[PDB]
Amino acid sequence: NIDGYFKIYSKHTPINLVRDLPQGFSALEPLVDLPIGINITRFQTLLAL
Amino acid sequence: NLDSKVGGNYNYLYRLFRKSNLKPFERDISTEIYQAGSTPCNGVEGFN
């Protein structure tokens, strides 16, 4: 959350293990940028029950 | 003169003062009443 914006970077990669993040290297290319004009102090994710 | 009428334009509003200085390109939409004193304000002419 800078200069009244919201920059999103994304990257998709398949995985073959069920434990944790792999021992690899991957960059996060920009995907979209859209403006928010209010300061943000807290957040929470959403899950499909 | 375009934005002037004999009746007057009192719709235009400004904040005389705030709790803290505004950051550039920041918009404040809250109409909170400043708690100058420890006592609650409740929108009355009480303690400051």
From Swiss-Prot, chain A:
Species, as recorded: Severe acute respiratory syndrome coronavirus 2
The record describes the protein's role as: Attaches the virion to the cell membrane by interacting with host receptor, initiating the infection. The major receptor is host ACE2. When S2/S2' has been cleaved, binding to the receptor triggers direct fusion at the cell membrane. When S2/S2' has not been cleaved, binding to the receptor results in internalization of the virus by endocytosis using host TFRC and GRM2 and leading to fusion of the virion membrane with the host endosomal membrane. Alternatively, may use NRP1/NRP2 and integrin as entry receptors.
Q: Which gene encodes it?
A: S
State the oligomer form and interacting partners. Binds to host ACE2. RBD also interacts with the N-linked glycan on 'Asn-90' of ACE2. Cleavage of S generates a polybasic C-terminal sequence on S1 that binds to host Neuropilin-1 (NRP1) and Neuropilin-2 (NRP2) receptors. Interacts with host integrin alpha-5/beta-1 (ITGA5:ITGB1) and with ACE2 in complex with integrin alpha-5/beta-1 (ITGA5:ITGB1). May interact via cytoplasmic c-terminus with M protein. May interact (via N-terminus) with host bilirubin and biliverdin, thereby preventing antibody binding to the SARS-CoV-2 spike NTD via an allosteric mechanism.
Q: Which residues are glycosylated?
A: N39
Query: What protein name applies here?
Result: Spike protein S1
Q: What is the effect of changing V18G?
A: In strain: Omicron/BA.2, Omicron/BA.2.12.1, Omicron/BA.2.75, Omicron/BA.4, Omicron/BA.5, Omicron/BQ.1.1
Q: Which residues of the full protein are shown?
A: 196 to 244 of 1273
UniProtKB/Swiss-Prot annotation, chain B:
Quaternary assembly: Binds to host ACE2. RBD also interacts with the N-linked glycan on 'Asn-90' of ACE2. Cleavage of S generates a polybasic C-terminal sequence on S1 that binds to host Neuropilin-1 (NRP1) and Neuropilin-2 (NRP2) receptors. Interacts with host integrin alpha-5/beta-1 (ITGA5:ITGB1) and with ACE2 in complex with integrin alpha-5/beta-1 (ITGA5:ITGB1). May interact via cytoplasmic c-terminus with M protein. May interact (via N-terminus) with host bilirubin and biliverdin, thereby preventing antibody binding to the SARS-CoV-2 spike NTD via an allosteric mechanism.
Name assigned to this protein: Spike protein S1
Region span, Immunodominant HLA epitope recognized by the CD8+: 9-17
- How the protein is affected by changing A36V? Increased resistance to neutralizing antibodies
Q: Where is this region: Receptor-binding motif?
A: 1-48
- Outcome of substituting E45D: Increased replication in human TMEM106B overexpressing cells
Superkingdom as given in the UniProt entry = Viruses
What result follows from mutating F47V? In strain: Omicron/BA.4, Omicron/BA.5, Omicron/BQ.1.1
Variant or mutagenesis effect after changing E45K: In strain: Beta/B.1.351, Eta/B.1.525, Theta/P.3, Iota/B.1.526, B.1.1.318, Gamma/P.1, Zeta/P.2 and Mu/B.1.621; May enhance affinity to human ACE2 receptor
> Which parts of the sequence are annotated with region: Disordered?
16-48
Role summary:
Attaches the virion to the cell membrane by interacting with host receptor, initiating the infection. The major receptor is host ACE2. When S2/S2' has been cleaved, binding to the receptor triggers direct fusion at the cell membrane. When S2/S2' has not been cleaved, binding to the receptor results in internalization of the virus by endocytosis using host TFRC and GRM2 and leading to fusion of the virion membrane with the host endosomal membrane. Alternatively, may use NRP1/NRP2 and integrin as entry receptors.
